[PDB]
Amino acid sequence: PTVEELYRNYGILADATEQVGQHKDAYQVILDGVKGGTKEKRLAAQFIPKFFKHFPELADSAINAQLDLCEDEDVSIRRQAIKELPQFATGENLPRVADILTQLLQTDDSAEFNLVNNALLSIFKMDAKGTLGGLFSQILQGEDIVRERAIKFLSTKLKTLPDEVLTKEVEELILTESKKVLEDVTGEEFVLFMKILSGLKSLQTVSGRQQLVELVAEQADLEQTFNPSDPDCVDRLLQCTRQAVPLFSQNVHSTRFVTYFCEQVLPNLGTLTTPGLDIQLEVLKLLAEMSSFCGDMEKLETNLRKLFDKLLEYMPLPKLQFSYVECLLYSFHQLGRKLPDFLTAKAEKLKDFKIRLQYFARGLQVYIRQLRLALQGKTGEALKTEENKIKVVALKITNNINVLIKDLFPPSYKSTVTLSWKPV
């Protein structure tokens, strides 16, 4: 088992060209290479895959030898052997190879990691479904560490594949397997699977997004009742509904999340958490984004009601909570469009509305004046001061409220504001 003899046998197999089949003996010498030392194992790792395709009568022995090198104590030997694994992924071996590579994702050596990723991508281009089979078997049946690595592989790598590879049938398989996985995922996995799925070209259509919204709803579990007490319910609902927001459009509606949020959430605030972002604002920002995408609500009036009431808790009677009011007012304004007959229809609580508005509008100016004063002469770099950024943002907030009040006057639902924390 020597390097001189490995080189000599390599030469024999290379120079034979057409007749390589007639030299099983030299190939055997090469496979014996794996029992040697470092330099010899390093050669076997290159030489076994190179001629593999010529010796079917030796195929199993070949893969087994390469796999021994893939679990070598020496990381550089493993690396050389892993780089070449896709060359064995021919005939009926691709599933077995795809399985091994997926395990190897757990390596902590970064160069190894990179090689394993690239090998997966290679076999992916040879046979996507066989490769996905390996990946998803591990995700479903393998060790936690492997399951995590496998999901991050789908999460980060599919996008680096050309469209040619990601056929309609492959995307269908990615959805089918994902739904199996989604029967039982942590929230962090959920987020990864939503990114994976929404990236699929076939799930980027109207019905594609409609399907995706339905998975979020299932995950979120909109038939449970809401418990404002423990966090096991709170951040899990927001993390979930967060994934649906980007899916919503004029044709893909938020109806169910809106209804749930109104009926089962607003009443429940504000019970809290630490820690240091404001959890009630987060909830209210979420509601306002989905509100513009609401469809035909069954429980419309009763819903618009609980919303109207949460509003008045922040628009007092003759220090204002502006950010909160931007959200609620925006939402109410979005849902009113559908039932103008509200307000017209309903009480003498409607003059108790006007009073609360007149008074807010008053406090608006003051605040707006103070902001515009603090901001003037300020030079564009000075605007970026995290302190000035907030002031700029607060002008969008306050000015947005003013437009919405100027609309709720025969009331109008004509005006369109861009939520302060959003781009145009």
Side-chain angles (χ1 to χ4, degrees):
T2 48
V3 318
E4 172 105 31
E5 196 184 344
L6 289 165
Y7 283 131
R8 215 194 64 247
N9 286 311
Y10 175 94
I12 292 170
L13 295 179
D15 298 328
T17 51
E18 293 177 350
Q19 293 177 335
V20 175
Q22 257 56 277
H23 298 281
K24 184 181 185 157
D25 61 356
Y27 195 61
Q28 184 53 76
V29 168
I30 280 147
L31 299 174
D32 289 7
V34 300
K35 300 284 161 47
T38 299
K39 297 183 177 168
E40 298 90 2
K41 282 186 286 164
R42 189 170 279 119
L43 288 181
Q46 312 162 57
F47 295 175
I48 302 175
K50 191 193 179 41
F51 307 108
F52 171 81
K53 64 179 180 180
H54 305 296
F55 309 87
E57 77 273 31
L58 280 183
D60 295 285
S61 208
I63 297 215
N64 295 340
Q66 194 74 6
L67 278 45
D68 299 340
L69 300 165
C70 291
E71 29 176 18
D72 204 85
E73 316 51 63
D74 190 339
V75 72
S76 75
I77 302 290
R78 298 208 307 279
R79 286 196 298 248
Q80 188 62 74
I82 293 159
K83 181 154 195 217
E84 293 310 320
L85 273 182
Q87 287 208 71
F88 301 90
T90 55
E92 312 291 306
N93 300 317
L94 195 139
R96 176 184 186 186
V97 171
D99 196 64
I100 311 306
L101 288 168
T102 311
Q103 303 249 28
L104 298 170
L105 277 175
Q106 72 202 310
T107 181
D108 288 322
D109 180 81
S110 94
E112 198 178 347
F113 185 66
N114 294 324
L115 296 166
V116 176
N117 275 285
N118 291 342
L120 282 170
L121 291 170
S122 296
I123 64 168
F124 209 112
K125 287 158 182 154
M126 297 159 50
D127 171 9
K129 299 183 181 180
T131 303
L132 288 161
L135 286 157
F136 276 107
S137 308
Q138 285 291 343
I139 290 175
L140 291 159
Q141 276 126 51
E143 293 162 344
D144 296 4
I145 293 166
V146 183
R147 172 195 165 95
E148 173 184 9
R149 297 295 174 104
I151 293 156
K152 198 70 41 68
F153 173 88
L154 305 178
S155 178
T156 55
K157 300 300 167 177
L158 289 181
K159 68 173 171 228
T160 76
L161 292 164
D163 287 27
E164 172 168 356
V165 162
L166 292 170
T167 62
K168 173 75 166 89
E169 280 198 357
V170 166
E171 288 184 355
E172 283 169 10
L173 179 53
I174 292 169
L175 182 54
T176 290
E177 298 301 304
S178 294
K179 292 161 102 154
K180 299 200 218 184
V181 174
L182 285 181
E183 308 285 17
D184 189 18
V185 296
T186 80
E188 301 64 44
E189 284 161 342
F190 188 61
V191 171
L192 295 169
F193 280 100
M194 294 300 307
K195 190 222 191 163
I196 294 159
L197 292 170
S198 35
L200 300 188
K201 302 168 303 274
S202 62
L203 288 180
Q204 273 169 5
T205 58
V206 168
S207 64
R209 284 184 281 105
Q210 181 55 55
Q211 288 179 60
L212 287 177
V213 162
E214 294 309 324
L215 294 163
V216 181
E218 302 166 26
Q219 182 66 24
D221 189 7
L222 290 201
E223 297 321 301
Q224 195 57 64
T225 75
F226 188 83
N227 166 81
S229 199
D230 74 323
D232 289 345
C233 202
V234 67
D235 67 277
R236 143 192 174 166
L237 178 83
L238 307 178
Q239 176 166 69
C240 295
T241 72
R242 257 299 167 213
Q243 301 315 312
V245 170
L247 301 166
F248 296 127
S249 68
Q250 58 154 335
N251 294 280
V252 177
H253 299 138
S254 58
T255 323
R256 295 176 64 186
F257 304 92
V258 160
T259 294
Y260 188 92
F261 264 55
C262 285
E263 294 189 319
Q264 182 80 58
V265 171
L266 290 186
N268 257 342
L269 3 3
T271 297
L272 295 174
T273 105
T274 315
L277 262 304
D278 168 12
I279 328 293
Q280 284 161 295
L281 180 49
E282 293 309 323
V283 166
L284 288 173
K285 287 161 126 83
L286 251 166
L287 174 61
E289 294 184 62
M290 306 183 280
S291 64
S292 64
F293 299 116
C294 198
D296 302 327
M297 283 182 82
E298 192 64 87
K299 325 179 80 87
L300 187 48
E301 182 156 55
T302 171
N303 268 63
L304 203 65
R305 179 95 184 107
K306 310 182 198 61
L307 211 163
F308 177 80
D309 280 74
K310 194 64 190 179
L311 187 51
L312 314 182
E313 301 181 36
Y314 290 96
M315 306 214 285
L317 276 161
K319 199 186 304 182
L320 303 175
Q321 252 169 308
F322 295 103
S323 45
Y324 285 49
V325 176
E326 194 205 358
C327 298
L328 294 157
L329 202 54
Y330 180 86
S331 307
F332 183 104
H333 174 99
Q334 280 298 313
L335 299 191
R337 320 197 169 208
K338 294 168 170 285
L339 177 63
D341 185 73
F342 195 79
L343 286 193
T344 305
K346 183 178 179 180
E348 197 222 357
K349 185 89 178 182
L350 167 54
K351 188 163 204 170
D352 188 24
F353 193 45
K354 189 200 197 74
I355 191 64
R356 295 176 179 264
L357 288 195
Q358 190 115 56
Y359 185 63
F360 210 80
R362 194 150 295 145
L364 266 199
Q365 310 186 37
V366 182
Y367 191 39
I368 295 186
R369 185 197 66 239
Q370 296 178 342
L371 296 167
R372 291 254 258 146
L373 276 169
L375 297 178
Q376 75 159 2
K378 300 223 172 313
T379 59
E381 193 82 27
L383 285 168
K384 307 289 183 29
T385 285
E386 198 63 26
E387 200 204 23
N388 295 343
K389 265 178 164 189
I390 277 157
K391 279 178 186 310
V392 180
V393 175
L395 273 171
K396 294 155 68 174
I397 290 168
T398 56
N399 274 280
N400 280 352
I401 296 183
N402 188 63
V403 189
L404 298 165
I405 289 173
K406 179 62 173 171
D407 289 345
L408 263 32
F409 59 88
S412 32
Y413 298 96
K414 283 61 182 186
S415 302
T416 313
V417 315
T418 299
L419 295 174
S420 64
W421 64 92
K422 303 285 287 178
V424 210

